[PDB]
């Protein structure tokens, strides 16, 4: 029904900041991939809008943004009609008359369409630094929303979302002048929507998911995101930003939300965003003794240079590369569970996953059983599965004679399915103003606090699981091997 | 452990009816396939003890016992040496004198024992009509018993075990002054190890499954027996038993006790007993209304007769060759559930299962979820699975597109491992003096309501499902499709 209704009106995508790396790198190739698989409609209208000078706009589509364009030897004709859909306005994100002369481009664009429905949709996408983003929006609000005749507006925002509660309510109170909440989208591009539908519809749709989701069953929950390359020479931008900012405190607390939510009203997007929130809300500020900090030191085999070896970061720093850290949710359904975020660059493998342990049965099993377990993982590939005991056939053929058993209970990227998911009108996976900030001010009072230097980086060679004291928390809160 | 200590002391198998049809065509197969399979003990020896005459016994062993064992192209030296171990005392069971001599010819066995404990164990087979029990228990009490040095005594006691609570309470009585609970064997040849294994260990060593197993998460409980097969020529036996008495008063309501019980205090045999009483005790009795009978006419192909065609049976009769009836059980675990047994001959198929249906999340999957379910199958084959309802990768990706997917949760028959389980001395799966007296109890008002005309089956074409107001009561007992 959503679909049908997108191809029934004028679509523009107008990327602000087109001439950057994101744009080229990230975007350009992100919708070329919707547009290969079927997920643009026909007569979509893409508007590349930048303030840097671009005489030859064919030679820029062709010789700049095509060479970022996947599996381009088996997708030739593709391309070079990918590419007729795309234009190029040179302008500036503050001028009055520029949204104007823009607006009137995409006018004509929105009345030639072929369509029944009358106007258009307009996709604003701010491939551009925050600082920029309130002039662009009040430059949109001002001279170029959709057509009173018909169409929505959407603006989907990059990331850095401020970078501790007060900067981000600072940008969120810049913005909302303009755009309200159906319209901004907030977007994490590693929130994949398999992952998201696997938490959500094997929990809600079962009646035996649904019913050991609690602390009554469940000993702890771990929310995993590891990787194996370092900060690759650029240890001076990770420097202001640390691992907690980079992808603890959103993209491992929007999992976290989606994991510990109660029952929404509906499926509804916003139903969904309203119980991200409310159990958001149940949890505490983290404590420094609930955090234990890593900062990777050179690998053993030499080929990973520590951190401290870039020459891009400052001397001395304590800026951590690897987090561990319990979260408690205090309400009806989560008390006294522990929530364990883990996050972690250059260790010992690449991997992504959600990992329930339930509580274990003691009797009457004893030593013939284990708890059982629940993983979700979408890092190195997605899988979902569940651990439990089961009876061993044949003989001595006791009771006590058992084995663990494992259940298998189971394409555009994330990144892509989010902009689709944008298209069609689908917030689930974007950060809620509201929400945002609640995620803001459950981590600010440790970010100052490492910022004050109360809590330092224990040391790791890179190549390692990192230090050590992070295996002690863990197992010291809640977790069994 | 237990194993260790059965090849420690002599063992003397004693099979009393030996000239009759269970012993040649079933009882002594299975000790040869359990032969076969290593489960006897080396020196194992083995009397058959009957009345009839024998001049030849090696003739006897070769001629008639031999031409059952199965596989026996494949097994002929296996067969000439387990036939060694078998000896044929031609006697009385009701004589003192005939229990000394054969006292004297176990004790002379047992004695020559070359491992390590004296005394020996003996193992009683009565494959005599339970006419005989008393007599021959008395004869064993007085005269046979184990050597004072040590060893054990067991009695297997075949079927009927009465017909009602009266005739079944006399029979325990008469045994009771010979021989306790930890001696009496009450087999039931169908129920199978591997069934109550998934029954027991698939629970109980799970958080999982443990927390579901009630009312607040179960909708309705179905166990079912199916044969394609009729009386098969022999109604006249099959007239005055019928169906509930045949399969549904012994062999599915042991199904039932393990599948409802609570959690034993052990894994020991005689605490899962305790616990299959204690829940039998809380069922009332079966109500009229809460039954539908059936007897089978004869095939739309002509290749079944009809249950009223066999010569045998006796003209007019109302006996019932199929049941479908709700049994309450009214504890905390289980009140409100209604548990289905379903029990027929000369229907469509041949299947023997347990069904479990899990309530079904209304909210807020809707039309896209539908009750989970849980799946111990034994007949044609064993099998246990789950069902659930998962998310449909691609698109349009919405978390209404779901998916019904089947979790698979997954050497001697049924029989062959009783007989092993006695051997050993596990007494789970054979029904105990209080436990029987209590499914007696549930089944009897029902049998003589039946006796007396006040219900009379429906006929149902062979070959056919059965009575359609039957599977109209299990849809209105709890059961969705
Ligand atoms: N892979 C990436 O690059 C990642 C970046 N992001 C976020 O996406 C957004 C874009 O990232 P990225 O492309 O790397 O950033 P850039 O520094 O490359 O800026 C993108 C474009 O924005 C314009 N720009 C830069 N600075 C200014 C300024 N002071 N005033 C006006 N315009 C400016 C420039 O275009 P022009 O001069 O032509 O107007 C520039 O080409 C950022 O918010 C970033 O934090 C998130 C995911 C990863
Ligand atoms: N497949 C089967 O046969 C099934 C039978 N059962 C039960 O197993 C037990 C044995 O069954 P089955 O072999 O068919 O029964 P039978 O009628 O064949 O009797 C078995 C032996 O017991 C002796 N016997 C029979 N009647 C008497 C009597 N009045 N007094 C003394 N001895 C008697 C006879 O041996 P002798 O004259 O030499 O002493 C007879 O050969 C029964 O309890 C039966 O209900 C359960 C499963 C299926």
């Known amino acids: 029904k959503v679909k049908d209704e997108q191809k029934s009106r004028a679509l523009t995508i107008i990327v602000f900041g087109a001439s950057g790396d994101l744009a080229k790198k990230k975007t350009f190739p992100a919708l070329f991939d919707l547009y290969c698989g079927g997920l643009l409609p026909p007569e979509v209208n893409i508007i590349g809008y930048a303030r840097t000078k671009v005489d030859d706009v064919e030679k820029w589509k062709h010789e700049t943004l095509m060479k970022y364009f996947s599996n381009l030897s088996e997708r030739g004709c593709h391309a070079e009609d990918f590419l007729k859909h795309i234009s190029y306005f040179c302008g500036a994100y503050d001028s009055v008359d520029d949204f104007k002369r823009l607006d009137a481009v995409i006018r004509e664009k929105e009345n030639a369409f072929k369509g029944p429905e009358k106007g258009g949709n307009r996709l604003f996408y701010l491939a551009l630094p925050p600082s920029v983003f309130a002039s662009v929006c009040e430059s949109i609000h001002k001279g170029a929303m959709p057509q009173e005749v018909g169409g929505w507006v959407r603006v989907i925002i990059e990331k850095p979302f401020g970078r501790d509660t007060k900067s981000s309510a600072e940008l969120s109170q810049a913005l909302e002048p303009f755009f309200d909440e159906s319209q901004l989208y907030r977007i994490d591009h590693y929130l994949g929507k398999e992952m998201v539908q696997n938490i959500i519809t094997t929990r809600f749709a079962n009646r035996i998911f649904s019913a050991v989701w609690n602390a009554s069953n469940i000993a702890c929950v771990q929310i995993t995101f590891k990787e194996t390359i370092g900060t690759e020479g650029r240890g001076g931008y990770f420097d202001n930003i640390g691992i907690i900012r980079d992808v603890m405190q959103n993209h491992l607390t929007q999992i976290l939300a989606l994991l510990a939510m109660e029952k929404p009203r509906s499926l509804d997007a916003e139903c969904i965003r309203d119980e991200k929130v409310s159990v958001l809300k149940c949890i505490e500020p983290i404590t420094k003794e609930n955090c234990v900090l890593g900062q990777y030191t050179a690998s053993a ?176 809160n809640g977790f069994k091997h």
Chains 1, 2 share one sequence.
């Open 301 to 476: 085999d030499g080929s990973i240079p520590g951190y401290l070896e870039d020459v891009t970061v400052p001397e001395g720093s304590t800026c951590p590369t690897f987090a561990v850290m319990r979260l408690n949710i205090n309400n009806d359904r989560w008390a006294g569970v522990p929530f364990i975020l883990k996050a972690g660059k250059a260790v010992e493998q690449k991997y992504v996953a959600i990992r329930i342990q339930f509580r274990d049965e003691v009797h009457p099993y004893g030593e013939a059983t284990q708890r059982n377990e629940l993983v979700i993982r979408a890092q190195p590939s997605e899988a979902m599965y569940v651990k439990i005991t089961t009876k061993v056939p044949g003989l001595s053929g006791d009771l006590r004679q058992t084995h663990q058993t494992e259940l298998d209970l189971t394409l555009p990227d994330a990144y892509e399915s989010l902009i689709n998911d944008a298209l069609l009108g689908n917030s689930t996976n974007f950060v809620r103003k509201d929400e945002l900030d609640v995620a803001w001010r459950i981590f600010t009072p440790l970010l100052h606090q490492i910022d004050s230097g109360e809590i330092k980086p224990i040391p790791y060679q890179a190549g390692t699981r990192g230090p050590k004291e992070a295996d002690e928390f863990i197992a010291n």
